[PDB]
Amino acid sequence: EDILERSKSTNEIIWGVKYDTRLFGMMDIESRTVQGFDVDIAKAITKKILGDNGKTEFVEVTSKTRIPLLKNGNIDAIIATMTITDERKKQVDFSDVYFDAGQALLVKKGSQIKSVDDLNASTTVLAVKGSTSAANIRQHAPDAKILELENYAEAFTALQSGQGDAMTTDNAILLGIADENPEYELVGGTFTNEPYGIAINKGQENFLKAVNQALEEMHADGTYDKIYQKWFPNETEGKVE
Amino acid sequence: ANEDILERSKSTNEIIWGVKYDTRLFGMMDIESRTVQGFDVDIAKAITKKILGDNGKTEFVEVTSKTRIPLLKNGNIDAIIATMTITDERKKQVDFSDVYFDAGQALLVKKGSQIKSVDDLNASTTVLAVKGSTSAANIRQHAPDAKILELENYAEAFTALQSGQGDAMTTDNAILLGIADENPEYELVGGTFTNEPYGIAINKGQENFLKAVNQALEEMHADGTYDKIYQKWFPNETEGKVE
Ligand SMILES: N[C@@H](CCC(=O)O)C(=O)O
Ligand SMILES: N[C@@H](CCC(=O)O)C(=O)O
Ligand SMILES: [Cl-]
Ligand SMILES: [Cl-]
Ligand SMILES: [Mg+2]
Ligand SMILES: [Mg+2]
Ligand SMILES: [Mg+2]
Secondary structure, eight states: OOHHHHHHHHTEEEEEEOSEETTTEEEETTTTEEESHHHHHHHHHHHHHHOTTOEEEEEEOOTTTHHHHHHHTSOSEEOSSOBOOTTGGGTEEEOOOOEEEOEEEEEETTOSOOSGGGOOTTOEEEEETTOHHHHHHHHHSTTSEEEEESSHHHHHHHHHTTSOSEEEEEHHHHHHHHTTOTTEEEESOBSSOEEEOOEEETTOHHHHHHHHHHHHHHHHHTHHHHHHHHHOTTOOTTOOO | OOSOHHHHHHHHOEEEEEEOSEETTTEEEETTTTEEESHHHHHHHHHHHHHHOTTOEEEEEEOOTTTHHHHHHTTSOSEEOSSOBOOHHHHTTEEEOSOOEEEOEEEEEETTOSOOSGGGOOTTOEEEEETTOHHHHHHHHHSTTOEEEEESSHHHHHHHHHTTSSSEEEEEHHHHHHHHTTOTTEEEESOBSSOEEEOOEEETTOHHHHHHHHHHHHHHHHHTHHHHHHHHHOTTOOTTOOO
């Protein structure tokens, strides 16, 4: 079914977002609503496509569940800190890039670790089980011990308790943890490129074109820049110019 | 300059590209064959064949980071494809194509250096960059205490590194790789500390040519021409590829 047609009929686009990723998609206990950069970009795209009265629905996805839910039609699009990769394009299409992340390290302030180069056989790195981040750290720091945890929260609790010397995932995700926990900081720049895209099921070319046209309009009229400034007021590197 | 580049091509069957002549892997003059070679050169040739068809001709003109925008805006070249990062400040001067390479600024040091990342640059360290370059400006932001010695070109910056006139050299990671492959005593350290998405720059008021360049890139991504060219130049480096 053509999602562009259906979404006009139901006046709604269904977005798969994270619920546990501060700055991108986080379930907010105060308002009982999900918030972040991915959420606000979804809302803005939906208004470009459907008009100012268009509705958004958000459905919680993880890195593990997002493509299966997309392929089964539970959601119309994934916007969930999702890197565009050739491997994933065997399964989905992607929009234009809307954020430029990169894999990085989070440590306790005062750590002797200042770069991925410092992750030798003496170090233990925390990563999420099944993630691209875990796979990447094994190639970039082949002698480090990797401890895999269920999710970001569990990885950060293990870092705080000293079960590992560093935690790894995308820089902008780690930022959402560092700004909340000032005893921790990012170190060493990035050692991958993680360009985020919006994933759409194969065979939805009309909807993909509409999403890309929405993004184009948002870049042209400053909506994109406003949303970026809101969530990343002191870090410009991730912005798509 | 104001003459429309696609209209002119109806007569000349040519696109004139501004490329580096000194940047191994991107645009480098080969002395034996007297021809420039690199990823940027190959992308330019492939785009020209998409726009003009099978017998479309390419012409290459040397630019530097200093001369590329002046030459473009004066009409000496039709487009810049020369390791050029897209920035909003540059978008005041030129239009840009879609991103065709994903670089990032990095550091090159002698193996064994105490410097392991941008975090180790400070008032006691001298970093080598090219005069007037954005790389020098990015260092002043990410290493605000570092001393900067700006040199006229990459070759000069690298010999200054080799003779200890600076402690680290900085420019885009993919460019430093072109240097580290030539010089095994030196290595990249610390990953990247900026994003440097490369675009093709086109003068303002050339919107039909800009659309043609973007359509050419679209076609090359759709049919694997882009991927083949990427694999030729960066067979063991995956991160710069635009998917
Ligand atoms: N952006 C990376 C890591 C974060 C995530 O999985 O959401 C990826 O898509 O693999
Ligand atoms: N890509 C960076 C550094 C290389 C160059 O100047 O060509 C820039 O456009 O400034
Ligand atoms: Cl050497
Ligand atoms: Cl590809
Ligand atoms: Mg990057
Ligand atoms: Mg990639
Ligand atoms: Mg591709």
